[PDB]
Each structure stands twice: as structure tokens, then as C-alpha cells.
């Protein structure tokens, strides 16, 4: 029932906007962001699957008005150990 | 609670110039700059919404004369979670 | 030795998707993510060869719907030498 | 105390810039900075006139070795800007 | 003294494969790998000249099936200063 | 008169070859290598101007047979202070 949601941007400003836009719905928690170099930044949230889909949709839309979005994705997860697949 | 302002440049020189122009007024705090690769540098400031809007306009204006501006943005009230990114 | 599984993608998002399918599809331990530039991310797992083969197949398949998969590979018996190369 | 910068593509052009800069004027080398895309920034300090001459010279010199992407002088940088350098 | 071998790839998976192929023979030692950005990863080995030649050829052959080979090179007798740059 | 010599490559293997060739061909000491990301590596040597000139020429030619050379440069230096313009 609990998903992980991601917006990956090229540019930091757009990722910060994506993060802010996603948590605007109190139904989503920010886990954090990941940098992999080459200007690529990934923002990650968790919450109920439906909330996460809606949050990620809004976050991507917002980021695209600020900079470049490279990927938007939602991963449903198991009830225990939801974040154990995340880096760092 | 406090507004968030960002000027993101390609090039450090342009970013430092943006940083300098932004801190020119007293009610603006420079949080720092962030590097993410591909030459991309983001300067981040905090303050009252009005001060931050004016600072970021100015930072963007100053930087574009030195190098490439990639993003200029203000979030009047960032959510408390976003503070984990700064 | 415990086999090694690797899925390498362009973008972190496809890679997290891969990690999800991998540890979900078989008894593999997530070793970590590795960044090398040009947007390339490698997800690495460990386990017995059969589990790793199944996980790697699953990770690659899942990731191809999310982003570009650049490499998929299994080393059934890595050396200790090579394990000092790995993030563990 | 003025701030000077030469930003090049490639480290070699940058090191050439540092050489021309500290040779042609009374500037102190504060350091090098890398930001990706092959971009390296050389930073100097000194009185503005020295810094202006150094950056002019460093850029001219760096251009003989490689590509200069940015050149800039900040006569009086702010105190907060001093913590990011 | 010992010879130096390098297999440099674009892609990490390819580099790990090259490393595994090279250290398969007992007289070749893995010195380490280096990342320099742009996806370029270098695997470095030491051993007798002959072993290092066969090892690097094999590492490159293995790696090219997984990703891109960027450099394959052997230094029969490295000069000592060169060891001050190795991992 | 003491100079600084540099060969800058895209790729590490070509740089190691440049380094080896430089200290092998002339009475120059290897100062070190610098990575600035994006595959760019700079090898630096020190010695008399003639030696540094002979080394860098030999380093560039050797490296060009192994990979991509981006820059080759000799910097004559003052008597005192010869290495203080170097980074890190």
C-alpha cells in the first residue's frame, strides 16, 4: 500500500520545486534527494500509493515550468522495509 | 517559514557574481551554493518574500552578464520538509 | 563465492526501479549503487547464482520501461580481489 | 581584497592563467574550483588594480592554451561571499 | 620489477567484468579501479610482462561484450615515479 | 631555470602513459595528477626548462597513441615558489 515516488531533474532548482510541490499535499513525506553527477538530481517521497502518484504528477508539472524533468516514476513497496532499496 | 530564492548558473563565476549581487541588501541571507555537475551551480538565499524576489531578480540580472543563467526561482513559503534539502 | 548481479542504467530512477524488482524477485542482498558520470548508475546485488540471475533479469526488464538500461551482467564466482572493488 | 576569477575549460589553461595572474600583478592565489563540464575556476585576491591586471593577463594567457568561459572582477565582494570562496 | 596493465571502459559493469577476467590467472594482481567521470573507469593490474599482456587482452575482450572499451594498454617496466600516482 | 610541464588527457590510461613517458624521457620529476571530472586528467612534472620541454613532448606523443590528449603545456617558473601555483 506504501509507494516510493521520484522526480529526477537536470538542474537543482527544478528538483527543489518538484520536492516542494509534492509535499504540498500533507499526504506525502519527503525522504530526500540524491545527486549522481552530470547535473542530475533525484527527489524521493514516500506515502500511500494513490497520494504518491498524485504528488509526483504535481511535482513533475511544477518542475517542468522551472527547468528540465528527466524522469517521473512511482514504485509501490512492501509493508516492512520500504526504503531498503534506496541509496545512501 | 522564510522564503527561498535560487539562482542557478552554468559556471561558478556567474554564480559567485549572483551571490554577491543578492547579498547586497541587508534582509537577505546567503545560505550557500550547491554543485551538481555539468557546470551547474545553484545559489540559495533566505528572507522575507519581497527581499528574496528582489534579490533573485538582481542575482539573475548580474549573473547573465558573466555567464549562463539556468534557473531563477522563488518559493515564498517552502514546506518544512524542503528544509532537509538545503 | 556469492554471485554478482549488475544492472546499469542512464539515470537514478530506472536504477531504483531495477533495485526494486531485483530484491523482490529473488533472495538477493542489495550491495549498493555506484555513480561514474555520464548519468550512469549501476545497481549491484549478491546472492547465490540462480537468485542473482533471476533478479538481474527482473531488474533489467523492469528498468527498461522507466529509462535506458546500458548493461546487464552476472558474475557467478567473483574473486576476493574483485570484492575489494565492490561497495559491500 | 578585491576578487578576481578566470574560468577555463580544462585544468591546463587554468594553471596557465594562475601563472600569468600572480606573475603580472600583486595577487594572492586563493584556489581552484571544479564544477563539471570540464570547467575550472582560478580565484585570486588583491587590490582591484592588481586583480584587474591579473585577470586580464590570466585570460589572455589561458586563451593561448585553451578556452576561457568567464572572466570577472568583483572590486568589493561581501563578507558573506567570503565564506563560499 | 613488475609490469603495469590498464583496461579502461565506459560503463562500470564492463570494468568489473574486465577486472574479474584479469584476476582469473594467479600471477596477475588487481591494483584497483579509478573513476574520472564521463562514465570512464580504469582497471589496473600488475605482474610479469607476459601475464599482464594476456590479462589485459582478456579483460578488454570480456569488457567489450558488456560495454565500451576506451583504452587497453601495457607498460612493460613502469618508471618508479608512476607508482606515486597509482591507487 | 625550473619549469612545470602538463599533459591533459581525456581518459586515465592515456594520462598514465604520458606520466611514464615524461619521467622516462627527461630529467623531470613527477609532481602528481589531477582529475577535474568529465574524464579530464592532468599529469604534472617539474624540472629544468629543457628537460620539461623534452618530457612534455615525449609524454604527448606517447599518450596520443593510447588515447585523447587535450592539452600540452610548459610553464617556465620563478626561482623560488615553483609549485605554489599548483592545486590541491
Curated annotation (Swiss-Prot), chain B:
Pathway(s) the chain acts in: Polyol metabolism; 1,2-propanediol degradation
GO CC annotation, single: propanediol degradation polyhedral organelle
Description of what induces expression: The first gene in the pdu operon. BMC production is induced by growth on 1,2-PD vitamin B12 medium. No change when grown in the presence of 1,2-PD, ethanolamine and vitamin B12, suggesting it is possible for both the eut and pdu operons to be expressed at the same time.
Practical uses of the protein: Artificial BMCs can be made in E.coli by expressing pduA-pduB/B'-pduT-pduU-pduN-pduJ-pduK (in this order). Enzymes can be targeted to the BMC, and appear to be encapsulated within it. Upon overexpression and mixing of purified sheets with 2-ethyl-1-hexanol, will form closed shells. Enzymes (tested with endogenous BMC enzyme DDH and the peroxidase activity of cytC) can be encapsulated in the shells; the enzyme is active in the shells. The shells are permeable to a variety of compounds, showing they could be used to make protein based synthetic bioreactors.
Keyword tRNA processing: no
SMART domains the UniProt entry points to: BMC
InterPro entries assigned to the protein according to its UniProt record, in alphabetical order: Bact_microcomp_CS, BMC_dom, BMC_shell, CcmK-like_sf, CcmK/CsoS1_BMC
Superkingdom, natural source: Bacteria
Protein name: Bacterial microcompartment shell protein PduA
Recorded name of the encoding gene: pduA
Curated annotation (Swiss-Prot), chain E:
Gene3D superfamilies per UniProt: 3.30.70.1710
Every BMC domain range: 3-87
Keyword Transport: yes
Phenotype when changing residue 82 to A: Decreased amounts of PduP in purified BMCs
Effect annotated for changing residue 35 to A: Slow growth at limiting vitamin B12, wild-type at saturating conditions
Induction field: The first gene in the pdu operon. BMC production is induced by growth on 1,2-PD vitamin B12 medium. No change when grown in the presence of 1,2-PD, ethanolamine and vitamin B12, suggesting it is possible for both the eut and pdu operons to be expressed at the same time.
Disruption phenotype: Cells do not make BMCs, diol dehydratase is found in diffuse aggregates near the cell pole; it was later found this a double pduA-pduBB' deletion. A single deletion forms larger than normal BMCs; it is not fully complemented by protein produced from a plasmid. Grows in an interrupted manner on 1,2-PD and vitamin B12; grows for a while then stops, then restarts as toxic propionaldehyde accumulates and then decreases. Increased DNA mutagenesis, showing propionaldehyde is a mutagen.
Key words of the record: Bacterial microcompartment, Transport
Effect of mutating residue 38 to H: Crystallized, central pore is less symmetric, no change in shell permeability, increased permeability to glycerol, wild-type growth on 1,2-PD
Keyword Transport annotated: yes
Compartments reported by the entry: Bacterial microcompartment
UniProt-listed InterPro entries: Bact_microcomp_CS, BMC_dom, BMC_shell, CcmK-like_sf, CcmK/CsoS1_BMC
Biological pathway: Polyol metabolism; 1,2-propanediol degradation
Miscellaneous comment text of the record: Bacterial microcompartments (BMC) 100-200 nm in cross section are formed during aerobic growth on minimal 1,2-PD-B12 or anaerobic growth on 1,2-PD-tetrathionate medium, but not during aerobic growth on glucose, anerobic growth on glucose or pyruvate-tetrathionate. BMCs can constitute up to 10% of total cell protein.
Known partners and oligomeric status: Homohexamer with a central pore of about 5.6 Angstroms in diameter. The hexamers pack against each other in arrays. Interacts with the N-terminus of PduP which targets PduP to the BMC. Modeling suggests PduC, PduD, PduE, PduL and PduP interact with a cleft formed by the C-terminal segments of 2 adjacent PduA subunits (on the BMC luminal side) in the hexamer.
PANTHER family: BACTERIAL MICROCOMPARTMENT SHELL PROTEIN PDUJ, PROPANEDIOL UTILIZATION PROTEIN PDUA
The protein's name in its UniProt record: Bacterial microcompartment shell protein PduA
Species of the source: Salmonella typhimurium (strain LT2 / SGSC1412 / ATCC 700720)
